[PDB]
């Protein structure tokens, strides 16, 4: 969503479900904005 950063470790996608943009985490990352490394 523009050049103002939202998701950390992932791709941004619109959740028409909750009507707010969500983050699609890449492997080994968790969180609402994919901000954490999952050490497990």
């Amino acid at each position, epitope marked *: 969503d523009s050049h103002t950063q939202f998701c950390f470790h992932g791709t941004c996608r619109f959740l028409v479900q909750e009507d*707010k943009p969500a983050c699609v985490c890449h492997s080994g990352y968790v969180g*609402a904005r994919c901000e954490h490394a999952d*050490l497990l």
Partner: antibody
Amino acid sequence: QVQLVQSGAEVKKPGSSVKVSCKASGYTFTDAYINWVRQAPGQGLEWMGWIWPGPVITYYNPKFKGRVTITADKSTSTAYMELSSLRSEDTAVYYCARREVLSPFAYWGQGTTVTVSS
Amino acid sequence: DIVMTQSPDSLAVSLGERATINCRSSQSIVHSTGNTYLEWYQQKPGQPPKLLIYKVSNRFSGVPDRFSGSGSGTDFTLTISSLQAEDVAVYYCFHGTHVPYTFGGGTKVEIKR
């Protein structure tokens, strides 16, 4: 204005389960994590897990072996903490704390005393 | 999984004297953005913890200037310049960089007499 309000004390027999509640007010509920911390007597602090209520997301402390369950009521701005198969070791003050993305535990609930006894 | 280790354990410091609490992470706790989500909390009996320091060195709004945090990737310290009667509590470091989140063991500060 930001308040985290927990339910009252519990006495639960060994083996049973306990649901602790947390009413959150003064901010948008889908915009912060609701964390859970516990503290057994004389003992230090133990993070249990977290919940993002928006597009619902959880992460728990593995040391609990999936006994802890964190739910969120969008309608009533409450996040629940359910802990199953209660042991004497689970006797503690259960806390909930607010955390914004990569921000600290600025807000805390008063605590909930759960006593596990026969 | 990260192991936060508080070095002092129990600290007895006279009034107005300097108090230093040490904490250590087993693995690096530097976030991908280059920030380190290490925080200090103060807890008094029959009370929920209070935020003191966040992001290693940032003093939370309303915290007296006597409180200050500092660190280096795995080693971190909480400092009280001049101990006050009010500062007698248990201090916890916290790691919120990586999941799972980790609390330290805690350090009791008492008045040395």
